Amino acid sequence: VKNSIIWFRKGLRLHDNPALLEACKDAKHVYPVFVLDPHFLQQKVSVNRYNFLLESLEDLQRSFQARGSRLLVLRGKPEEVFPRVFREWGVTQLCFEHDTEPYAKVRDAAVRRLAAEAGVEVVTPISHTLYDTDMLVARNGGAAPLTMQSFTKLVDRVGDPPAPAPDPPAAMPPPAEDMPSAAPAATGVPTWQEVGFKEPPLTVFKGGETEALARLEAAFQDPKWVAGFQKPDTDPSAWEKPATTVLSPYLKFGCLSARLFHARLLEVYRRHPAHSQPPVSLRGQLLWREFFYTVGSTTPNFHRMAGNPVCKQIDWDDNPEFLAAWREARTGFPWIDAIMTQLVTWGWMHHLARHSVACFLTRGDLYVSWERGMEVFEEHLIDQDHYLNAANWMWLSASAFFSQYFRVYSPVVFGKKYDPEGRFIRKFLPVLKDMPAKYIYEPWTAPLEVQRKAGCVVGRDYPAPIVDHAVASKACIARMAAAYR
């Protein structure tokens, strides 16, 4: 008979899951499997992203039960768990979504060999990205493009990406009854307290495929906003209704199909001929995701500086005092400390908001390595993608893709253009809620009668600025110009 296993790592979804469909085809029994590392928290990972993953698994659980099945959350490592359940369940086929990530390439190489030892068929379709990221390198001559212009001219020569796969059947072959490794008490979705977190999550974005589809339909309620989308013209100060889609946490874990997003974008573009074009368009943002995935999967040490052939060797300073003040939201700049607060509370900030902290820490003011700030993002960001994190942090440090270090944001004037009243600051930094808008972005310039009337004395309730931006930026820019020579 055909007993199959659909292995979930990314792509935590039922729509456009081309492996679920193969695993359910002519199958007597289907085993939805997610391998969960029981330790990991004893080795880095906030309770915001892990609970977002757990909520995404609970959404798959309710979706599989509504179709007569059940999600199996197995404990242990894949190399130790799969050889057991292969012969316990009589597995003849193993399906899982393809992953071009470095740890994944090793992990999958190991499982495949084990699946070949047990006479199991391995089917790995491509559905996490838009196109075969390897066909994009092959058609280009054998090398990945290094500019967005050249990549967008490449995908247009390939054509439209594959359409989203059809929905799975309303009834699925359930797991076999009375299997020891499929016991409900052992294969259940754990909560954030049971895995070893003593702190509750504070994010406002819930995980799951159901929430990803609902937030998708909400963004497409106004097709005029979808068509004329220009990313660089958005608001980094909007928090009640973010100026963007906020679909990156769902696209990272796979709760939302990139093929479904692109297909819905083309439907709106066909009825709006004057829609925005890449890279500023909504489709262009998906192409940024596809551009960095193509380059990083073919580039050695992409997540690092040393050994990276595409990164610029920069003598970044080792200054734990500046790094700690930056990650603890105590730099003295309310605009910076608000975004670094939104980082640990929500796990998501606007793209231009992430531009201000990454520039302030690196080539702008503190001259600290982009790897140090990337490690701080890798823990709090609920949308933490390996290739997208690394390329964007090299972008902001003028170490790759970006070479314009004379462009430094002011930790005081950038946010004032969008939010002169400081609504964003008063929300995430309530210690400055009564400060007048004239000194909200520069509290150290406020009079002391003013400071006390508002309950924020600089040096007692809110720290002074750790650096002078005019002095710090002048010194960092000069060193960047020497390195680029």
Ligand X SMILES: Cc1cc2nc3c(=O)[nH]c(=O)nc-3n(C[C@H](O)[C@H](O)[C@H](O)COP(=O)(O)OP(=O)(O)OC[C@H]3O[C@@H](n4cnc5c(N)ncnc54)[C@H](O)[C@@H]3O)c2cc1C
By CB under 5 A, name the binding residues for Cl ion: 409-410, 414
410 binds, among Cl ion, ligand X, none (CB under 5 to 8 A by kind): Cl ion
As a whole number of angstroms, the distance between CA 361 and CA 109 comes to 38
Would you say 471 is a known binding-site residue? no
- Closest to ligand X by CB, 29 vs 275, is 275
- Contact present, 432 and 462 (Cβ < 8 Å): yes
392 binds, among Cl ion, ligand X, none (CB under 5 to 8 A by kind): ligand X
- Closest to ligand X by CB, 249 vs 463, is 249
Judged by CB under 6 A, does residue 231 bind ligand X?
Answer: yes
- Closest to ligand X by CB, 279 vs 436, is 279
Q: How far is the CB of 218 from ligand X (least distance, A)?
A: 12
Q: Which residue is nearest to ligand X (CB)?
A: 244
Would you say 89 is a known binding-site residue? no
Candidates 4, 46, 63, 285; binder of ligand X (CB under 6 A) is 285
Would you say 64 is a known binding-site residue? no
- The DSSP annotation for 49-73 comes to HHHHHHHHHHHHHHHHHTTT---EE
Judged by CB under 6 A, does residue 53 bind ligand X?
Answer: no
Would you say 354 is a known binding-site residue? yes
Candidates 377, 401, 405, 428; binder of ligand X (CB under 6 A) is 377
- Closest to Cl ion by CB, 168 vs 236, is 236
- Closest to ligand X by CB, 275 vs 289, is 289
Would you say 351 is a known binding-site residue? yes
Would you say 225 is a known binding-site residue? no
As a whole number of angstroms, the distance between CA 286 and CA 265 comes to 10
Instruction: Report CA dihedral (193, 199, 205, 209) to the nearest 10 degrees.
Output: -20
Name the helix (H) or strand (E) containing 78: helix 78-88
Would you say 46 is a known binding-site residue? no
Instruction: Report CA dihedral (453, 456, 459, 460) to the nearest 10 degrees.
Output: 90
Judged by CB under 6 A, does residue 351 bind ligand X?
Answer: yes
As a whole number of angstroms, the distance between CA 245 and CA 145 comes to 27
Candidates 51, 392, 410, 451; binder of ligand X (CB under 6 A) is 392
Residues 198, 200, 201, 206, CA torsion sign:
positive
Would you say 299 is a known binding-site residue? no
Residues 212, 213, 219, 223, CA torsion sign:
positive
The interface with ligand X within residues 235-274 (CB under 6 A) comprises 244-248, 251-252
As a whole number of angstroms, the distance between CA 30 and CA 96 comes to 13
Judged by CB under 6 A, does residue 292 bind ligand X?
Answer: yes
Instruction: Report CA dihedral (276, 277, 283, 287) to the nearest 10 degrees.
Output: -150
- Closest to ligand X by CB, 94 vs 396, is 396
Q: Which residues pair with 35 in a beta bridge?
A: 74
409 binds, among ligand X, Cl ion, none (CB under 5 to 8 A by kind): Cl ion
Contact segment (CB under 6 A) with ligand X among 313-321, 378-386, 424-432, 476-484 equals: 378-386
Residue 365: both structure tokens together = 């003011």
Within 10 Å of residue 447's Cβ, how many Cβ atoms?
10
Peptide bond just before 279 cis, omega within 30 deg = yes
- Closest to ligand X by CB, 29 vs 98, is 98
CA 347 to each of CA 45, 206, 380: distance values in angstroms, whole numbers, following the listed order: 11, 11, 5
Binding site for ligand X (CB under 6 A): 231, 244-248, 251-252, 285-286, 288-289, 292, 350-351, 354-355, 358, 377, 381, 383-385, 388-389, 392-393, 396
- Provide the annotated binding site for FAD: 231, 244-248, 285-292, 348, 351, 354, 383-385, 389, 392
